[model samples]
Target: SNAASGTFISDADDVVSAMIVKMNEAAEEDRQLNNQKKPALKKLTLLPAVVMHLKKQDLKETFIDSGVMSAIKEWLSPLPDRSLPALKIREELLKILQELPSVSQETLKHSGIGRAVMYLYKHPKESRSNKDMAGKLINEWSRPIFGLGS
Candidate 1:
């Protein structure tokens, strides 16, 4: 790991920018997993670091501007089957979204991830923690955003 002995804010945003790119790679990996032959699920590995770094409340626009948010939206987007790998990544992304308060209702609402969160919460086979946590976030995220409760 690297240390920011004399770090500044812009320097930190640079990291955010870089992280955004990695998120895209993770999403790409996810997409390709269903493309044909993949021995292991690769998306799961990259998301841990992405979620870890996403805890910061700073420069939320960087997420959108760098297109990470869009990538996340697609990550949670509907799949034809009840894909377990998708659900795993979805769970991870929902947790990241929960901590990103700066990602306004507009972005949240439009990205359609709110719908994804609700699905995860209601899906019978989903992790209980993910369902419980998604419920918590949905209620707090604004009723319009998820249309689950007011």
Candidate 2:
């Protein structure tokens, strides 16, 4: 039931991937953009957000630990200044993620993966299957953030 009714956002792969990279990069500022920051990547598990949205429950322990809000703020803060390469990359990344079919419409209410997942869940009538979209993005893009052998 997380899927919303709307057209799916498409071709947001680059921006989504770039956003993840920027987050990872910012977490450990010592690393250059091209270097590995996977070990520093934060877990983006959305169970708490989902529960909070669906049941009006406060999973503070889970939510606080997730750091989703801060991550989103950090991700969004650099968007205004396109002069820096990193900021520009992040801006472009945001644009890319926004274009991913229906994602902006679906997850725009909530922050992070929770919003995206909820959007997909609410709108099951989108062009692409939510599971497939999530799986592909997570597999191809999230692995690097998780510090897997990418």
Candidate 3:
């Protein structure tokens, strides 16, 4: 809806970016779920974009303009962008590859893609052929990238 007004800002985009950077910065040595790698800068800028935009608004009403937003912005402004610490890239890669096919199968089963495949799999007496096709689709779609395959 906001996109129609030429305001393409999305909170989800910020959240997704944070999630990606957070995952990427997780510790390589520590197995603890709470342990994170060093901070990354670009990720921190995501939230400030919204805050700065709000602060720049011209509101002349002093009663309503308590500068509360400015206060919050100031409080949050000092946080340094965290660095991306070393991660177990190889381990994460292997784990993701091993899980992707199964996840894709589940996704297909629960989503439109899966429903269409199932319908084909159950059609007439060619169910086996449909299953083969479904498997092939998943295999092709889930193929490893960046030399991660066996």
Q: Which candidate is the best by TM-score?
A: 1
TM-score of 2: 0.24
Candidate 2: tens digits of C-alpha lDDT, residues 1-150: 346468343233333334445554564452332255323222123223322232312332222234433454344332222222333223233333323332332233345554444343344443344345434544433333655554
Cα lDDT of candidate 2 equals 0.36
Mind giving the per-residue lDDT tens digits that candidate 3 earns over 38-131?
A: 3433323333442333232232122113332222212222122321221122112212222322233343343334333334334453435435
Model 1 C-alpha lDDT versus the unseen true structure: 0.69
The lDDT per prediction is 0.69, 0.36, 0.33
State which candidate, 1 or 3, has the greater TM-score.
1
Cα distance off (Å), candidate 1, residue 84: 1.8
After superposing candidate 2 on the true structure, give the runs of residues whose Cα lies further than 4 Å from its correct spot: 1-25, 28-73, 78-86, 104-106, 112-150
Highest lDDT model number: 1
Residue 29, model 2: Cα distance from true site in angstroms: 3.9
lDDT of 1 by residue, 1-150 (tens): 566677546777788888877766666765566565553355567767777777766667676666566667666654354566666777667767776756677776776767767776888877787788789878877755546655
Q: What is the Å distance of residue 105 in model 3 from its true position?
A: 18
As for lDDT, the candidate ahead, 1 or 3, is: 1
